[PDB]
Design an enzyme around this catalytic site. Structure first.
Site, PDB file in Angstrom:
ATOM      1  N   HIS A 134      -8.727   5.858  -4.356  1.00  0.00           N
ATOM      2  CA  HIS A 134      -7.421   5.435  -4.348  1.00  0.00           C
ATOM      3  C   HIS A 134      -6.563   7.105  -4.247  1.00  0.00           C
ATOM      4  O   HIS A 134      -7.019   7.868  -3.251  1.00  0.00           O
ATOM      5  CB  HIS A 134      -6.938   5.064  -5.585  1.00  0.00           C
ATOM      6  N   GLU A 160       2.554   7.705   5.280  1.00  0.00           N
ATOM      7  CA  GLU A 160       3.556   7.950   4.259  1.00  0.00           C
ATOM      8  C   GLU A 160       3.448   9.448   3.367  1.00  0.00           C
ATOM      9  O   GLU A 160       2.320   9.726   3.099  1.00  0.00           O
ATOM     10  CB  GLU A 160       3.262   6.937   2.958  1.00  0.00           C
TER      11      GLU A 160
END
Ligand SMILES: [Mg+2]
Ligand SMILES: [Mg+2]
Ligand SMILES: [Mg+2]
Ligand SMILES: [Mg+2]
Ligand SMILES: [Mg+2]
Ligand SMILES: [Mg+2]
Ligand SMILES: [Mg+2]
Ligand SMILES: [Mg+2]
Ligand SMILES: [Mg+2]
Ligand SMILES: [Mg+2]
Ligand SMILES: [Mg+2]
Ligand SMILES: [Mg+2]
Ligand SMILES: [Mg+2]
Ligand SMILES: [Mg+2]
Ligand SMILES: [Mg+2]
Ligand SMILES: [Mg+2]
Ligand SMILES: [Mg+2]
EC number: 3.1.-.-
Lengths: 84, 122, 140, 37, 84
Positions: free
Chosen positions: E83, E46
């Site tokens: 993250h 992505e």
RNA sequence: GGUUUGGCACCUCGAUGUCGGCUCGUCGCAUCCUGGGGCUGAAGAAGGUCCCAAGGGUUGGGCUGUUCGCCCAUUAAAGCG
RNA sequence: CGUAACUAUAACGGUCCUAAGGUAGCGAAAUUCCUUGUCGGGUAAGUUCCGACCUGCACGAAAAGCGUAACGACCGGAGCG
RNA sequence: AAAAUGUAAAA
RNA sequence: CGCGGGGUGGAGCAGCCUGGUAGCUCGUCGGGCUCAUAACCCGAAGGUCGUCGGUUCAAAUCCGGCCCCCGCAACCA
């Protein structure tokens, strides 16, 4: 300081997670002694000739010896064993 | 008497209908081509599905000519058109059949298959 | 190459070469020398070609003495231009040599070698040459 | 080397025969044959 | 496509290799899944934007992740834990 | 060597028509074929390189005003001045 | 001058200058030097021709711009007879 | 008066 | 090559004419505003002046030789 790994200079350390991590210990220890000593101290870090013009080889055991090649901040990895 | 630019009626089912004589393959400067001589050529118009498409540079043997052929025995034979029969590099007919009569000059010239195949030989 | 590091003037006249030799007519340095039989302008690169030629021959050998120095500017006009509108721009440098001048001298190598090494150099040259020993060259 | 303007000796078995007004150079092996033309 | 880490990456990687082998092997597993053909592959490629932009992100184990950069041969690992 | 581009400005400005083609050739050899021959990293067939030798040969098209080129189909070769 | 997922390219940005920085539409053209541009097409083979692309040496709007049925002893490219 | 956008893992 | 113009912080431009230190915008850096990034606000560092020589007490500046960039000119046969 970015770390470099050639094509062949990768599958080596990679297969070391399948056959005794002993040799791995060296890689890592040798790596750090190179981040503050391009080619000084551990493994009696010395330069090279002809083929390896400008390549400094550090001693892992006696056979294998990962040859680095510092430059404008960037340690290179070529061969942990045999040659190129 | 075939020469470059001459149109030859193709006497066989290699799919082609008419070819233009590109060059006569006799000497290094052969003026004309006649019954039995081989020629290089361009396919000028052919039939739909066919072993040969137009624009193809082929090779063929002259089998009929509008210029009478002289026979060693003093007779002469003349046809109504100038026809040939496409062949391959080994000089073998690229087609399976041959239409219309052919000149027996074709035999001594060494083109048996075409002769046997030919419906008539004058 | 070989050319004056600096000069009072950049372009200088031609002038004719009249016999004699004026200088360097005797050895004075090595053991074998090469002298000029006929006059000429030797190019900064005929020398270097002879020099290299020498060492090329006897590798890791003696010492070569280049007795002449191309200090004269060689002029040449642009290709295909008419006469006039000034003097040409400089194309390179040469050294005036006259019959008798010793051009090269070798030392520290077997005679048999010096003979060859010098001989070869004579070939890279526009004039006839003659090799020498060291006898009556005792002006010193 | 069959023909040139600098016929010299090559091997120690090279002769400088001079026949027909020309300065040939006959030798044991052909490759050394010459002729100053 | 030579491999290149760096400061925060090698250290990020060593901790993985010396704190949990479940993610070490999972990490270099993708590195081989990329090294050859980047972008498309495993994890869940992505294209990233902003802070990273020129950097790509491969979903690893949800929280954890790995950021890199592709450039006509020569990959570039930048991060291993956290993250984004 | 004197086929290129030039330099020079010597006859010619009371005029030496200045590219290309066509027709007609003729000459040179530094030979493109064909004929002789020496080496070859020449097994043979085929090539390579140099030597001797013009007697005779040295095709037809596409494109462009072209010379030249490139391309097509050939050829023993499609020689250069 | 700089910048987007390999590369490319740059919708975006930075800056300097102007009276204002060429819009639509055309574009290797009666215009394109490099150039026989590069892809197509036509031909056995096409420096021309036709269709495209646009890094337009050096189009562009009434010294008009891009089109257009019909017309032409106008100039170009093809076939058939 | 005027003031933009949005860090990627849904149990 | 023949004329004339110009190479100055990372980018793009002043300064050279009037020889005596360098300016402007963007960027870069440190700090705020913010939940965060912009924008916005505060304050910074950064320029061998293409190069090799010259004139001067002192050269970005003036004179010279090359080196790349740009622009004109290359006509009559
Ligand atoms: Mg068709
Ligand atoms: Mg990129
Ligand atoms: Mg002349
Ligand atoms: Mg006169
Ligand atoms: Mg006069
Ligand atoms: Mg006249
Ligand atoms: Mg008269
Ligand atoms: Mg002309
Ligand atoms: Mg001859
Ligand atoms: Mg803009
Ligand atoms: Mg065109
Ligand atoms: Mg033109
Ligand atoms: Mg035609
Ligand atoms: Mg025509
Ligand atoms: Mg129009
Ligand atoms: Mg969201
Ligand atoms: Mg800030």
């Amino acid at each position: 300081m970015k770390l470099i790994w050639s094509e062949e200079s990768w599958d080596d350390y990679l297969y070391w997670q399948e056959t005794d991590k002993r040799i791995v210990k060296k890689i890592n220890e040798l790596i750090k002694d190179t981040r503050r000593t391009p080619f000084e101290g551990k493994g009696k870090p010395e330069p090279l000739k002809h083929n390896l013009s400008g390549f400094w080889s550090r001693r892992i055991t006696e056979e294998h010896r990962l040859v680095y090649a510092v430059t404008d901040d960037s340690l290179l990895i070529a061969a942990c064993r045999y040659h190129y | 008497m075939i020469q470059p630019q001459t149109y030859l009626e193709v006497a066989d089912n290699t799919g082609a209908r008419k070819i233009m004589c590109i060059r006569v393959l006799k000497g290094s400067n052969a003026k004309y081509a006649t019954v039995g001589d081989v020629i290089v050529a361009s396919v000028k118009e052919a039939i739909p599905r066919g072993a040969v498409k137009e624009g193809d540079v082929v090779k063929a043997v002259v089998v009929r000519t509008k210029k009478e052929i002289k026979r060693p025995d003093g007779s002469a034979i003349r046809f109504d058109d100038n026809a040939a029969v496409i062949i391959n590099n080994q000089l073998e007919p690229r087609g399976t059949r041959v239409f219309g009569p052919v000149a027996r000059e074709l035999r001594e010239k060494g083109f048996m298959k075409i002769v046997s195949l030919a419906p008539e030989v004058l | 190459m070989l050319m004056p590091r600096r000069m009072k003037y950049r372009k200088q006249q031609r002038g004719r070469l009249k016999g004699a030799t004026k200088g360097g007519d005797y050895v004075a340095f090595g053991d074998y020398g090469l002298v000029a039989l006929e006059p000429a302008w030797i190019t900064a690169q005929q020398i270097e070609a002879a020099r290299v030629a020498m060492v090329r021959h006897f590798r890791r050998g003696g010492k070569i003495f280049i007795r002449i120095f191309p200090d004269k500017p060689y002029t040449k006009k642009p290709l295909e231009v008419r006469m006039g509108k000034g003097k040409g721009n400089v194309e390179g440098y040469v050294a005036v040599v006259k019959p008798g001048r010793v051009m090269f001298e070798v030392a520290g190598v077997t005679e048999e070698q010096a003979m060859e090494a010098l001989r070869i150099a004579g070939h890279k040259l526009p004039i006839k040459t003659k090799i020498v020993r060291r006898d009556a060259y005792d002006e010193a | 080397m069959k023909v040139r303007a600098s016929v010299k000796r090559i091997c120690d078995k090279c002769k400088v025969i001079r026949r027909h007004g020309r300065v040939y150079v006959i030798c044991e092996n052909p490759k050394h044959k010459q002729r100053q033309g």
